[PDB]
């Protein structure tokens, strides 16, 4: 299984713009599920307080990118993606917030990408409520940890 931990720095600033009702949208670097493996990346939003549904939620989405090994891998990507926002409080057992999502072959999002970054992504509009960040040490040293673990 490939595992990638996205360190999102400067996070205090990002929460501040969300409060000021400024759209916040971030993309991870690309990363490989393996070598050879798929190249994926992540989209995280901070939803405005004035949104209809999902107000004040964190959104989280996985996208396929064009990769070195694309021509060698089976398409569409089929498998499991586990998206976790990690707890950095000092307290076993730590309480991570995670959702496990199933890659179904019927989706367009995991078809072979032809553009550098496929705009069709797959994930959760309502991944985690912001008011859950104020209730655990999810942010430490002004940094948020988003873990992506891919199973095939």
């Amino acid at each position: 299984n490939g595992i990638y931990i996205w360190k999102i720095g400067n996070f205090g600033m990002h929460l501040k713009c969300q409060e000021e009702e400024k759209p916040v949208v971030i993309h991870s670097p690309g990363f490989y599920t393996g070598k050879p493996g798929y190249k994926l990346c992540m989209r995280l939003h901070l939803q405005l307080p004035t949104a209809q549904r999902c107000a004040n939620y964190i959104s989280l989405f996985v996208h396929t990118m064009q990769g070195e090994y694309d021509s060698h891998l089976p398409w569409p990507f089929q498998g499991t993606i586990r998206l976790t926002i990690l707890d950095q409080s000092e307290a076993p057992v730590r309480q991570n917030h995670e959702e496990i999502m199933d890659a179904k072959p019927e989706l367009l999002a995991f078809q072979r990408p032809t553009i550098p970054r496929n705009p069709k992504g797959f994930g959760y509009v309502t991944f985690m409520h912001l008011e859950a960040l104020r209730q655990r040490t999810f942010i430490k040293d002004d940094t948020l940890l988003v873990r992506c673990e891919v199973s095939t």
Partner: peptide, 9 residues
């Protein structure tokens, strides 16, 4: 809460 495809922008 379940997953969904989602295009941007």
């Amino acid at each position: 809460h379940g997953p969904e495809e989602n295009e941007y922008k």
